[PDB]
Symmetry: D2
Subunit: 115 residues, 4 copies
């Protein structure tokens, strides 16, 4: 899957491997509650963050640790991190792919939402 | 400017006009303190957010109200907003341009940082 | 596969299906010779354009018919098409994935190259 | 202007200076005729390619020499160049700004069209 995060590296032209991703869900008290976490695989993908039943209606934040990624490569990047915040599953179940393309001073994200 | 935010609309091929932008600076208590706010002009640009002297070293969050923009056009977009979070002015004064390209299910941002 | 093309729609947050893709190899007269073609599937993907044996070193042009895609949705887009021109296999056989994210007035493309 | 091209570097967070830009107009033999050329300035901008009087209706190709740009920085990039092909002035005179954001394996381009 219901949630997949895919991260590519625009400098090297490869998947961005081992990028930490933390997901949060907005709580009733308007706090961000830790919902899930993982690291992208060798293919730059992170599957298994949640299940269909667990991925309930709500507002989610997907936080991608871009800074740690670039610093590990010896680069001081511009952004502290990259966040994607969206309402999910408010009109029935969907499969969400959050895709992110990274450069040291830039990132681009899109969502692919299907049945 | 020392800080400029520029927003374009990829559906219409024009500046994104009247987009609300809120800027915050991280406080000692690790809270986000309201730092500035404005709306993009007819050219999709927002100048005059701060001055050189006021734009001190720190971590800033630039929050772009993409959701209100799309909803006003009768579109239900994917993202709640678009945020850009970065350290600024920690190696001398700089001019920052935060540029953002918007589509209903996607945005792309880059920074241009000069002397 | 060694050549894969994937096309996403940034406005609707979906794969772009049935998009015409035409590939060319550069000739010693600087003319562009037809190499292969197809349309994207329901997942927005186009596989099987070529084989590891037909895909020798050269300069290739990948043309994606974005105009037809948009016009069918009732949209009059900016570009005639999106183009990706690159040298392939110059360092020995590789697998290429060309991704294109589409909006009426913008396109973004990236390449993942694997060995 | 009626034709402006602006090129940014997503890796360094700076304008891309001295980037060669070649424009062509499509001919009735489907051949590409030289229309105008130049290099970007220190602000990454190229103005004065053409006049409102030479810029009649037609299909134009804008070619940006991204390869030379990267190789000078010691980087072996993916693309031979970045291309933007579009119909112009078909609805009467307009002003076009073509923006390109560059990374070694990716480019993103958008158009702002004004009347
Ligand atoms: C084209 C969208 C996309 C990407 C990959 C991150 C993208 C995102 C933003 C851009 O500006 C360009 C491409 C992508 C999505 C799913 C994949 O399996 C592979 C690629
Ligand atoms: C090319 C970067 C850029 C933009 C405009 C928002 C951009 C951003 C992300 C992309 O994927 C493509 C273009 C821009 C920056 C300053 C300007 O005066 C005009 C345009």
């Amino acid at each position: 899957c219901p949630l997949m995060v895919k991260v590519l590296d625009a400098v090297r032209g490869s998947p961005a491997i081992n990028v930490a991703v933390h997901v949060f869900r907005k709580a009733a008290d308007d706090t961000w509650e830790p919902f899930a976490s993982g690291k992208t695989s060798e293919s730059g993908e992170l599957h298994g963050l949640t299940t269909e039943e667990e991925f309930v209606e709500g507002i989610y934040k997907v936080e991608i640790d871009t800074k740690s990624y670039w610093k590990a490569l010896g680069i001081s990047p511009f952004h502290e991190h990259a966040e994607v915040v969206f309402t999910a599953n408010d009109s029935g179940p969907r499969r969400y792919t959050i895709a992110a393309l990274l450069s040291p001073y830039s990132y681009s994200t899109t969502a692919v939402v299907t049945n």
